[PDB]
Design a protein around this ligand. Sequence first.
Ligand SMILES: NC(=O)Nc1sc(-c2ccc(Cl)cc2)cc1C(=O)N[C@H]1CCCNC1
Length: 255
Amino acid sequence: VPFVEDWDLVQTLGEGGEVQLAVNRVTEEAVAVKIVDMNIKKEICINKMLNHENVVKFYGHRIQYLFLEYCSGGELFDRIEPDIGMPEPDAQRFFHQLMAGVVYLHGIGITHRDIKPENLLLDERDNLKISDFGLATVFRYNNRERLLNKMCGTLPYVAPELLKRREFHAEPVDVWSCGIVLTAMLAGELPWDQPSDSCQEYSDWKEKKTYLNPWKKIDSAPLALLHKILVENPSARITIPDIKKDRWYNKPLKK
Ligand SMILES: NC(=O)Nc1sc(-c2ccc(Cl)cc2)cc1C(=O)N[C@H]1CCCNC1
């Protein structure tokens, strides 16, 4: 078929250093194009291993060009109303989808390392897709776990052990960031600048002062889950299999 390989760049999508929408001249199929002038080699290699409904699909690469599954719903960040969040049933559905994507990644030995609402996209049916694997790395290979030591991610979303320890397990760090995402969705506010002993908001949380925001805005059920996720000691922190057994996680919700 002629012209089937021709794509038109019709509009600029987002940051990076640029995300553009490409439409096939013949089929009208759409794809997102990640443009980086120009690290990228690894992002491509990891992307090639991914195949899950809650992870942005990688089509190929042709400076460097990254061709990805187009998510017309944009960033989850934009569905969060400042100081409000979003309806609990919507937050729960997004959280279920986030967990499914994270379980998948962890199952293949990959850690994202930068989970936050700006890196969680939504498709036309509002299905959540984990995006931006520029910081991702392998934490398990040949059934052997490798400890992480590199400090990376985004401050308000990073787990405390990253700041305090020379080495740390990958999985609990991603679990922690998911908890910060859940907090944002339910409160429309991040709980602290960073989980440091010098941060008053973090000290307040460790002291269980849940009568304060953002906690006060969150229902007891999801709050009880957050109490299990945002645990300082990563070895005591709830794991995904246990999150799947949580009361709120399993609560039927409807708007
Ligand atoms: N694969 C894909 O479709 N990506 C999209 S669609 C979109 C989009 C934007 C606006 C609308 Cl209205 C619809 C879709 C923004 C981004 C995107 O990747 N943005 C990156 C920027 C840097 C932080 N991570 C996210």
